[PDB]
Amino acid sequence: MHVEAMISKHPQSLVQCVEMCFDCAQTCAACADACLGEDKVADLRHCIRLNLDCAEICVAAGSIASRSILRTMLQTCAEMCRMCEEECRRHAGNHEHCRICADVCKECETACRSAT
Amino acid sequence: MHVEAMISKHPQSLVQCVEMCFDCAQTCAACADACLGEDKVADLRHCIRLNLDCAEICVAAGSIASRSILRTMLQTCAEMCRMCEEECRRHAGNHEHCRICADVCKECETACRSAT
Amino acid sequence: MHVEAMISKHPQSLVQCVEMCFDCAQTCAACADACLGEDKVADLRHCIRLNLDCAEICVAAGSIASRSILRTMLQTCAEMCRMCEEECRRHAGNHEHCRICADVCKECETACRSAT
Amino acid sequence: MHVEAMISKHPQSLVQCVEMCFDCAQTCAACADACLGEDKVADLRHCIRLNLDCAEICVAAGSIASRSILRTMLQTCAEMCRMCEEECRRHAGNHEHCRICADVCKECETACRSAT
Ligand SMILES: [Cu+]
Ligand SMILES: [Cu+]
Ligand SMILES: [Cu+]
Ligand SMILES: [Cu+]
Ligand SMILES: [Cu+]
Ligand SMILES: [Cu+]
Ligand SMILES: [Cu+]
Ligand SMILES: [Cu+]
Ligand SMILES: [Cu+]
Ligand SMILES: [Cu+]
Ligand SMILES: [Cu+]
Ligand SMILES: [Cu+]
Ligand SMILES: [Cu+]
Ligand SMILES: [Cu+]
Ligand SMILES: [Cu+]
Ligand SMILES: [Cu+]
Ligand SMILES: [Cu+]
Ligand SMILES: [Cu+]
Ligand SMILES: [Cu+]
Ligand SMILES: [Cu+]
Ligand SMILES: [Cu+]
Ligand SMILES: [Cu+]
Ligand SMILES: [Cu+]
Ligand SMILES: [Cu+]
Ligand SMILES: [Cu+]
Ligand SMILES: [Cu+]
Ligand SMILES: [Cu+]
Ligand SMILES: [Cu+]
Ligand SMILES: [Cu+]
Ligand SMILES: [Cu+]
Ligand SMILES: [Cu+]
Ligand SMILES: [Cu+]
Ligand SMILES: [Cu+]
Ligand SMILES: [Cu+]
Ligand SMILES: [Cu+]
Ligand SMILES: [Cu+]
Ligand SMILES: [Cu+]
Ligand SMILES: [Cu+]
Ligand SMILES: [Cu+]
Ligand SMILES: [Cu+]
Ligand SMILES: [Cu+]
Ligand SMILES: [Cu+]
Ligand SMILES: [Cu+]
Ligand SMILES: [Cu+]
Ligand SMILES: [Cu+]
Ligand SMILES: [Cu+]
Ligand SMILES: [Cu+]
Ligand SMILES: [Cu+]
Ligand SMILES: [Cu+]
Ligand SMILES: [Cu+]
Ligand SMILES: [Cu+]
Ligand SMILES: [Cu+]
Ligand SMILES: [Cu+]
Ligand SMILES: [Cu+]
Ligand SMILES: [Cu+]
Ligand SMILES: [Cu+]
Ligand SMILES: [Cu+]
Ligand SMILES: [Cu+]
Ligand SMILES: [Cu+]
Ligand SMILES: [Cu+]
Ligand SMILES: [Cu+]
Ligand SMILES: [Cu+]
Ligand SMILES: [Cu+]
Ligand SMILES: [Cu+]
Ligand SMILES: [Cu+]
Ligand SMILES: [Cu+]
Ligand SMILES: [Cu+]
Ligand SMILES: [Cu+]
Ligand SMILES: [Cu+]
Ligand SMILES: [Cu+]
Ligand SMILES: [Cu+]
Ligand SMILES: [Cu+]
Ligand SMILES: [Cu+]
Ligand SMILES: [Cu+]
Ligand SMILES: [Cu+]
Ligand SMILES: [Cu+]
Numbered sequence: 001m002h003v004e005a006m007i008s009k010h011p012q013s014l015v016q017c018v019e020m021c022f023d024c025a026q027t028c029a030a031c032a033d034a035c036l037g038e039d040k041v042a043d044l045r046h047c048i049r050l051n052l053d054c055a056e057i058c059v060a061a062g063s064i065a066s067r068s069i070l071r072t073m074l075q076t077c078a079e080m081c082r083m084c085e086e087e088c089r090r091h092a093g094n095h096e097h098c099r100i101c102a103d104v105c106k107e108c109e110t111a112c113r114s115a116t
Numbered sequence: 117m118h119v120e121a122m123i124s125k126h127p128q129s130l131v132q133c134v135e136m137c138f139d140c141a142q143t144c145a146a147c148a149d150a151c152l153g154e155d156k157v158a159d160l161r162h163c164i165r166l167n168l169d170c171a172e173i174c175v176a177a178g179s180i181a182s183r184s185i186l187r188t189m190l191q192t193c194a195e196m197c198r199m200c201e202e203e204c205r206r207h208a209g210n211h212e213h214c215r216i217c218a219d220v221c222k223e224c225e226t227a228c229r230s231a232t
Numbered sequence: 233m234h235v236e237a238m239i240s241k242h243p244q245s246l247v248q249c250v251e252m253c254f255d256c257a258q259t260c261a262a263c264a265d266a267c268l269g270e271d272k273v274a275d276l277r278h279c280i281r282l283n284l285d286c287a288e289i290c291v292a293a294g295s296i297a298s299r300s301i302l303r304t305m306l307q308t309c310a311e312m313c314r315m316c317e318e319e320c321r322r323h324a325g326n327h328e329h330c331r332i333c334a335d336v337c338k339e340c341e342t343a344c345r346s347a348t
Numbered sequence: 349m350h351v352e353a354m355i356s357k358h359p360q361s362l363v364q365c366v367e368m369c370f371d372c373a374q375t376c377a378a379c380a381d382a383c384l385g386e387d388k389v390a391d392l393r394h395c396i397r398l399n400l401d402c403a404e405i406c407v408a409a410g411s412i413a414s415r416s417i418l419r420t421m422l423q424t425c426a427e428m429c430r431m432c433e434e435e436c437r438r439h440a441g442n443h444e445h446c447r448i449c450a451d452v453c454k455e456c457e458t459a460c461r462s463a464t
Contacts, residue, residue, distance in 0.1 A: 001349075001371050005463040006378035009444040011385045022370045023349050025407075030354035032284075036277055037359045045268055052178050052264075052284070057189070059373075059407050060176040064169050065378040069196045073173070076192045080185045087433055096357040104350055117233075118336055119253050122262035125328040127269045138254045139233050141291075145298040146238035148400075152393055153243045161384055168380075168400070175257075175291050182261040212241040220234055285412050289421070292408040296401050301428045305405070308424045312417045 014065060017115040021062030021077065024108035028054040028100050029082060034097035047087045054084040054105065071116055078112035081105045124205030128183060133231040137193065140224035141216050144170040144200060150213035163203045170200040170221065187232055194228035197221045245296060249347040253309065255292030256340035259333050260286040260316060266329035275325035279319045286316040286337065303348055313337045359417050362413060365463040369410030369425065372456035376402040376432060382445035395435045402432040402453065419464055426460035429453045
């Protein structure tokens with residue numbers, strides 16, 4: 001990622017938040033698709049949905065963070081990540097993709113809470 | 117828009133919120149580009165930035181609203197729209213694109229506040 | 233939508249393309265969620281996936297169209313819409329949400345092909 | 349990034365493409381804002397615009413790549429990155445943010461061309 005490089009070269013920490021929003025975005029988008037592909041998919045609906053929302057909010061939060069609504073947006077992104085960690089945590093026993101994503105969600109929650 | 121058609125045919129008002137999020141998304145994306153094209157662009161930086169953020173948040177809010185983080189997300193989208201109305205309102209005298217967008221922002225703010 | 237209002241007030245048809253990209257975006261996002269909620273969800277995986285991709289591409293295509301990659305992007309958005317119409321058409325007999333979305337996809341395909 | 353972790357744990361190289369799409373997304377979003385903040389902003393309009401489009405296409409391309417339109421989408425994302433490298437390359441002498449972003453664009457172009 002080039003968050004740090006770019007944030008020092010602009011004419012006018014948070015770095016961690018941005019790295020993580022894009023990381024967590026990609027990851028939940030991956031997890032939605034993985035859950036969608038499972039045989040027990042019918043049981044994963046809420047998880048897929050949350051993953052889709054967490055992807056969307058993290059892209060949004062990370063783009064904004066790359067440029068104020070930011071405080072608010074990072075609170076929201078923190079709330080979302082937590083919702084999505086909790087759900088992805090449930091499935092961590094049976095699905096390795098939800099262990100991986102649940103931890104990425106945890107780390108991005110942390111990162112949004114301390115950015116505010 | 118087909119928000120209303122689709123929301124009645126799902127196996128499990130808010131309609132207005134969704135219509136407006138996508139409307140206001142496109143509009144602020146249009147306004148960012150219009151301000152970017154102005155001769156007084158150097159004076160419009162904050163407005164362009166807000167427009168970009170309002171586009172991003174409204175897509176995000178509208179997608180989520182099409183599928184919970186929703187309450188929170190709609191509060192955030194309400195806060196953003198207001199921020200962006202206020203700024204786009206400043207420029208309504210001189211720029212017709214900011215009159216149009218400032219009103220779209222007002223109407224979407226309204227719509228998010230009453231969706232919550 | 234305010235595509236037409238805004239495109240006439242910028243300091244520097246396609247309108248139909250933009251209206252439709254945002255319409256079709258919201259619609260496929262709605263259809264993904266509707267299919268996700270079906271009992272036969274396990275059979276709808278490819279459709280949900282395509283709907284997610286068509287939502288993403290249409291937002292992208294519509295934002296770009298609101299501001300060149302445009303020709304290319306509209307070809308891609310045309311290809312996607314067609315892929316997603318074809319799949320959503322399959323399910324039009326059994327699911328009213330896929331009849332609605334399959335037609336929105338058809339109309340946006342048309343609109344991208346004639347924008348190029 | 350957790351592209352690699354997740355792509356091995358799904359029930360059904362490209363990794364490089366995805367890492368890079370999200371990297372290049374964040375970077376061009378950063379560069380748009382940096383150019384927007386420059387005194388010579390009036391001269392950077394085309395660059396800002398391209399950066400905005402490259403951000404949008406790369407998010408889109410990376411999300412899709414995380415889940416077919418993919419071949420097509422990656423061609424488009426390759427075309428965009430190149431357009432945006434070329435423009436960001438122009439400004440590499442005077443602006444360090446455009447040197448950084450022009451190279452991120454180059455590396456993501458490469459990565460999309462070999463993913464296809
Ligand atoms: Cu973040
Ligand atoms: Cu996040
Ligand atoms: Cu985030
Ligand atoms: Cu995530
Ligand atoms: Cu998952
Ligand atoms: Cu899941
Ligand atoms: Cu998630
Ligand atoms: Cu997230
Ligand atoms: Cu988050
Ligand atoms: Cu997250
Ligand atoms: Cu999750
Ligand atoms: Cu899960
Ligand atoms: Cu999972
Ligand atoms: Cu998960
Ligand atoms: Cu996660
Ligand atoms: Cu997850
Ligand atoms: Cu998440
Ligand atoms: Cu976060
Ligand atoms: Cu964050
Ligand atoms: Cu809304
Ligand atoms: Cu809105
Ligand atoms: Cu909104
Ligand atoms: Cu707006
Ligand atoms: Cu504007
Ligand atoms: Cu403006
Ligand atoms: Cu706005
Ligand atoms: Cu907005
Ligand atoms: Cu809003
Ligand atoms: Cu708005
Ligand atoms: Cu505004
Ligand atoms: Cu303005
Ligand atoms: Cu304006
Ligand atoms: Cu405006
Ligand atoms: Cu506005
Ligand atoms: Cu505006
Ligand atoms: Cu707005
Ligand atoms: Cu709204
Ligand atoms: Cu709303
Ligand atoms: Cu379009
Ligand atoms: Cu479309
Ligand atoms: Cu489109
Ligand atoms: Cu669609
Ligand atoms: Cu559907
Ligand atoms: Cu479907
Ligand atoms: Cu679709
Ligand atoms: Cu589409
Ligand atoms: Cu399309
Ligand atoms: Cu479409
Ligand atoms: Cu479809
Ligand atoms: Cu379908
Ligand atoms: Cu359907
Ligand atoms: Cu469908
Ligand atoms: Cu459709
Ligand atoms: Cu559809
Ligand atoms: Cu579609
Ligand atoms: Cu279209
Ligand atoms: Cu189109
Ligand atoms: Cu990529
Ligand atoms: Cu890229
Ligand atoms: Cu890309
Ligand atoms: Cu980029
Ligand atoms: Cu830049
Ligand atoms: Cu630039
Ligand atoms: Cu770029
Ligand atoms: Cu890009
Ligand atoms: Cu690219
Ligand atoms: Cu790129
Ligand atoms: Cu560039
Ligand atoms: Cu540049
Ligand atoms: Cu630059
Ligand atoms: Cu640049
Ligand atoms: Cu770049
Ligand atoms: Cu750039
Ligand atoms: Cu780029
Ligand atoms: Cu790329
Ligand atoms: Cu790529």
